[PDB]
Paper text:
In this work, we demonstrated that PECs in agarwood are biosynthesized from a common precursor featuring a C6–C5–C6 skeleton produced by a diarylpentanoid-producing polyketide synthase, hereafter named 2-(2-phenylethyl)chromone precursor synthase (PECPS). The last remaining candidate gene encodes a PKS (PECPS) sharing high amino acid sequence identity with the other four PKSs, as well as the highest 93% similarity with AsCHS1, and this gene maintains the Cys-His-Asn catalytic triad conserved in all known type III PKSs. The crystal structure of PECPS showed typical homodimeric type III PKS folding. Crystal structure analyses suggested that PECPS utilizes unique one-pot catalytic machinery that includes the release of a diketide-CoA intermediate, which has never been reported in other known type III PKSs.
To explore the underlying mechanism for the formation of the C6−C5−C6 scaffold by PECPS, we solved the crystal structure of PECPS at 1.98 Å resolution. Crystal structure (1.98 Å) analyses and site-directed mutagenesis reveal that, due to its small active site cavity (247 Å3), PECPS employs a one-pot formation mechanism including a “diketide-CoA intermediate-released” step for the formation of the C6–C5–C6 scaffold. The Cys-His-Asn catalytic triad was also sterically well conserved in PECPS, in a location and orientation very similar to those of the other type III PKSs. However, a comparison of the structures of PECPS and naringenin chalcone-producing Medicago sativa CHS (MsCHS) suggested that PECPES may differ from MsCHS by the so-called ‘coumaroyl-binding pocket’ (pocket A), which is thought to lock the aromatic moiety of the intermediates. Despite this, docking simulation predicted that the volume of the smaller PECPS cavity is sufficient to accommodate the 4-hydroxyphenylpropionyl-β-diketide unit. The significant difference between the catalytic cavities of PECPS and CUS is principally attributed to the steric volumes and placements of Asn199, Thr213, and Pro267 in PECPS, which form a constricting loop to cut off auxiliary pocket B from the overhead main catalytic pocket. Notably, ITC analysis revealed that the binding affinity of PECPS to 4-hydroxyphenylpropionyl-CoA (KD = 18.57 ± 1.37 μM) was dramatically higher than that to benzoyl-CoA (KD value is close to 1000 μM), suggesting that PECPS could use 4-hydroxyphenylpropionyl-CoA and malonyl-CoA to generate the corresponding diketide-CoA intermediate but could not form the corresponding diketide acid intermediate from thioester bond cleavage between the catalytic center’s Cys166 and the Cys-tethered intermediate. PECPS first accepts 4-hydroxyphenylpropionyl-CoA as the starter substrate to form a 4-hydroxyphenyl-propionyl-β-diketide-CoA intermediate, from the decarboxylative condensation of 4-hydroxyphenylpropionyl-CoA and malonyl-CoA. However, due to the steric constriction of the active site architecture, PECPS terminates further polyketide chain extension reactions.
Numbering used by the authors:
A (entry chain A), B (entry chain A): 7 to 391
Write the structure that this text describes.
Amino acid sequence: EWVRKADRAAGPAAVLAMATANPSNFYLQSDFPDFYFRVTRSDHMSDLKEKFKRICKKTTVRKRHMILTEEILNKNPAIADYWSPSLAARHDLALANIPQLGKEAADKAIKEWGQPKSKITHLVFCTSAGVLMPGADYQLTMLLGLNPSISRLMLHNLGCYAGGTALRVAKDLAENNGGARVLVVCSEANLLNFRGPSETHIDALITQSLFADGAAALIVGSDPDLQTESPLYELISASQRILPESEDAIVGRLTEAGLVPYLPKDIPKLVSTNIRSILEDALAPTGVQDWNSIFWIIHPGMPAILDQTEKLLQLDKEKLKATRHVLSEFGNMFSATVLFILDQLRKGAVAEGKSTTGEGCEWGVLFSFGPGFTVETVLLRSVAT
Amino acid sequence: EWVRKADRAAGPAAVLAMATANPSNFYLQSDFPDFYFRVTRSDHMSDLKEKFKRICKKTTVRKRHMILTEEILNKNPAIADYWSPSLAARHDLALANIPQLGKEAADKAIKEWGQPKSKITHLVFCTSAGVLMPGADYQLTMLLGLNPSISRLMLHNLGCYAGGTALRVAKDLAENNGGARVLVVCSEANLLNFRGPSETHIDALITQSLFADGAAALIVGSDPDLQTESPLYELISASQRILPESEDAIVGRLTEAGLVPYLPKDIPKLVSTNIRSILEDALAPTGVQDWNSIFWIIHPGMPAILDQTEKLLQLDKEKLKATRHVLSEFGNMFSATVLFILDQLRKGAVAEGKSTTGEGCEWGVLFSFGPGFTVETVLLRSVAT
């Protein structure tokens, strides 16, 4: 059966360009326990700093970019406390930084893409760093001079899986609308989550060892003009799932003092229990049988999950190389992290001279997660280099 | 040119079912100035109550449903103050009420629809009443027993235009995915916006005369099974637009004390300046030339805009009947209001015995607005009754 093309697109959505950006300011992880416990006026919790020193080392993170400088925290001490009224201050920083960081990545993706901005017909903007009305999607549209008639989808506070949601959304936008070009921006920062330490909230302390700032921007479109556009990946399928028996696994409470996390259930075991059949279902239409014949993007919000999945599916230790590089060099930038990893995977495949944007593989899987417990899974097809 | 149907849908997205729900508790507008100034411990502002009495009369609102009872406000006095730290309390009420109110409307829409819940493949959930992680989309999925693999899009804090966004989103979800059935829920309440009066913030006081609680639920799907499903409307086009010279027209600041509005620019003039060409562009593919040969849904967040548009396009005074009925009986329920109006328009067309779900008209326009200044415009096609 055939249908008239009419106003729709013929073929699957493709990533046509990708780029990332971060705040200029960064912290080496080796320096962070000292910096953190100083600026939060918590140097007296010697035994807690010792726990934090161990937490920070086991993250395998090396540096993290952050908007929050010692100077900004000094001018906003409520942000540095464990729990003081500070939401308005955090949202003032979000308005000054999140759309701007998104534009830095968007400029670079549009440059790689090579087409004029006026051909962008849709914008998907994800952030958990600040609820703005109008949103950062609006502010970015104004800063970039995009068409005022652009179709925007603003995704506030989905949490760490939203990079998968953004691709899932962009796929239908691109495929249903002939000529549509979708600018996808995940722009993230710890502005809502950053706070001082508490001996009674170790979960919250662990998040201070991992979360970081950064933005990723993509152009997604179907029916590429192969004379002016160069696909990097195809978005073949995109699915979302609540895992069984995962009620309240990850909760984020938005309060007067910003975002406060609550993580009672064991996240690594939840993923291990379910990852295999989720990826089997994803790979079912490809006829792949070797876990090592595909490329990998796994959200690294809990580094232990990377090791455990690697062992479980018996992956070649180079499979998660791009994933671990981003974790080491940038930390967990919330929903943007899997898109950083995608770009790093592409750049390493090209630099190392492989045959496909998927490190020589044809098929690939992108997997991220967050509150629900929710898992976003994307089936990707590489392109010949 | 033709394309293989493959996994996509053949025809345009259709509304297949619709229903609404509200909190049991309501307030007659004639009683509200007394109730409001009492519970906010503000009876001493006699001159402000007098302004409020006049504001409430000119709204043309008759009743409003609200979660907030005198009892709840007594147990949460910070909510009743103009500006006291209260976000966590407001979000506790959101978690206890917003997904639940959405389920009340969803149950009724699914009943009208007549198919099993397990055929729902997508959920679009809009609210500005509380940022939850996981969102009310998750909570509703759990309360309704929807498939854990449902594709959800959670839309937090877009503001009053999100009813148009929800239809715009559902359209692409339905049309790009063969067999997809999209549950659309706008569930809204004043939980973030409700506060005591200030002589120095008249804008905030006006919003207390209009905002109300309610949920609307729709089933949206392409390729209806005409032996089991009965389309009510077709979603023919859906567009979003930032109006020129409208920077900061509507701003909503999410603070320690909840949502605080800021409305410097003149909203009625902004709409009047731009409405006509926006609707002409919407109607361009229909060949309609008579503004009175189409049916109407206009977001009634500012009642003055209804009169002014009516005069400007010289509408038959019955055109905005369904719109004004919802405003009178329910007030402004944020993004849900245009969907209430759509359902009222359908119910009145059937009850009054007209030839189409569009009061006998073929084409219709749905127009809502909010921060940006953003306008969402939907072109609807009715169905023979």
